[PDB]
Design a protein around this nucleic acid. Structure first.
Ligand SMILES: Nc1ccn([C@H]2C[C@H](O)[C@@H](COP(=O)(O)CP(=O)(O)OP(=O)(O)O)O2)c(=O)n1
Ligand SMILES: [Mg+2]
Ligand code: NA
Ligand code: NA
Ligand code: NA
Length: 326
DNA sequence: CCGACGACGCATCAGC
DNA sequence: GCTGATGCGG
DNA sequence: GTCGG
């Protein structure tokens, strides 16, 4: 946190552009700048020093000079006083309310937590669950609790079918001391890129986790992605654990390394890595790395037997999960 | 200057 | 019912 | 908002 003041500023600018302006590329530009500054191993002393880094241009350079001189940014100071911008920004903190819904609600006069509760009927199902657990989903999860949640998920999956393999990814796999949620990669030998030899593969896991009252609510659910809510069991007389967000992704077993690379993130690491793959003439998603022809069209999946193979194709030295937190 | 900016699953909606 | 576009999320 | 070409 040598430059926490600067990266916090860029993060608030990114969120403003996403939530209020609906300028998704300004949001990514600010996020990338914040990321590159966050790993810069010196205390930044001017915007011209910062502009040397890739993703910091003239505009951000000027904002960093203002912030270093005064300790604040007038642009943000204004944004904070504007009641509409602040209301739109706040409502997007509810899961399922993005920038469109948030501006829609603030237009309808719904602009506080109390206003959301009174108008619960104007929310779809995801938004209703996001409002229900608003305070809980704001809390971090200590790694110690992540370890207990892992134990439950892995043992309940083993009880359904011993051939499942569940791998916790996200910030947990990157070694974070706390996580925003739990991300679970799931494979089963009956589900490959070649065939699906059993139905309900993800559903049976979700259903087992509901039966033991680990999973408490569902935000969305399809054949390969579950997004919902879970809770650790508490002891007699003990306060309940906060409810937590859980995501589960069932990935074809022969595409595991592309899947765990994707799900380990970070999101900015994946964007940098996939952008780099493009420049090297490949495309990477959670299933495959494929070459690009002269026309630009993706070819056939390349053989992959490790995360490191994916790095090798695009001529990157391997980075362990813990060094992917960008 | 200018196009490009990672890639995709699920929910919801318009239009048929 | 479907396909395609959009919002929102990972 | 930034960048490579
Ligand atoms: N725009 C995105 C968002 C996510 N992902 C991938 C990479 C990310 O680590 C994983 C879980 O995301 P999450 O939303 O769970 C974020 P994570 O890195 O796990 O940190 P926490 O806040 O502690 O949960 O999904 C991606 O590729 N592109
Ligand atoms: Mg996560
Ligand atoms: Na730069
Ligand atoms: Na939201
Ligand atoms: Na999150």
């Amino acid at each position: 946190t040598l430059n926490g003041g600067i990266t916090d500023m860029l993060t608030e600018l990114a969120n403003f552009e996403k939530n209020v302006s609906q300028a998704i590329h300004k949001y990514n530009a600010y996020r990338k700048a914040a990321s590159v500054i966050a790993k810069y191993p010196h205390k930044i002393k001017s915007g011209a020093e910062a502009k040397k880094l890739p993703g910091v241009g003239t505009k951000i350079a000027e904002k960093i000079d203002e912030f270093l001189a005064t300790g604040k940014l007038r642009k943000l100071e204004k944004i904070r006083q504007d009641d509409t911008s602040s209301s739109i920004n706040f409502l997007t903190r509810v899961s399922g309310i993005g920038p469109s819904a948030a501006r829609k609600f603030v237009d309808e006069g719904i602009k506080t937590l109390e206003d959301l509760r009174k108008n619960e009927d104007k929310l779809n199902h995801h938004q209703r669950i996001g409002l229900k657990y608003f305070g809980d989903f704001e809390k971090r999860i200590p790694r110690e609790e992540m370890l207990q949640m892992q134990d439950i998920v892995l043992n309940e999956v083993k009880k359904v079918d011993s051939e499942y393999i569940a791998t916790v990814c996200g910030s947990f796999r990157r070694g974070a001391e706390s996580s925003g949620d739990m991300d679970v990669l799931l494979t089963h030998p009956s589900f490959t890129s070649e065939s699906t030899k059993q139905p309900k593969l993800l559903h049976q896991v979700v259903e087992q986790l509901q039966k033991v009252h680990f999973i408490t609510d569902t935000l969305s659910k399809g054949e390969t992605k579950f997004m919902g809510v879970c809770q650790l069991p508490s002891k007699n007389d003990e306060k309940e654990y906060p409810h937590r967000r859980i995501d589960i992704r069932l990935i074809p077993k022969d595409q595991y390394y592309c899947g765990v690379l994707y799900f380990t993130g970070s999101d900015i690491f994946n964007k940098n890595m996939r952008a780099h793959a493009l420049e090297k003439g490949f495309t990477i998603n959670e299933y495959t790395i494929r070459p690009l022809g002269v026309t630009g069209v993706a070819g056939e999946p390349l053989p992959v037997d490790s995360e490191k193979d994916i790095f090798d194709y695009i001529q990157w030295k391997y980075r362990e999960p813990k060094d992917r937190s960008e």
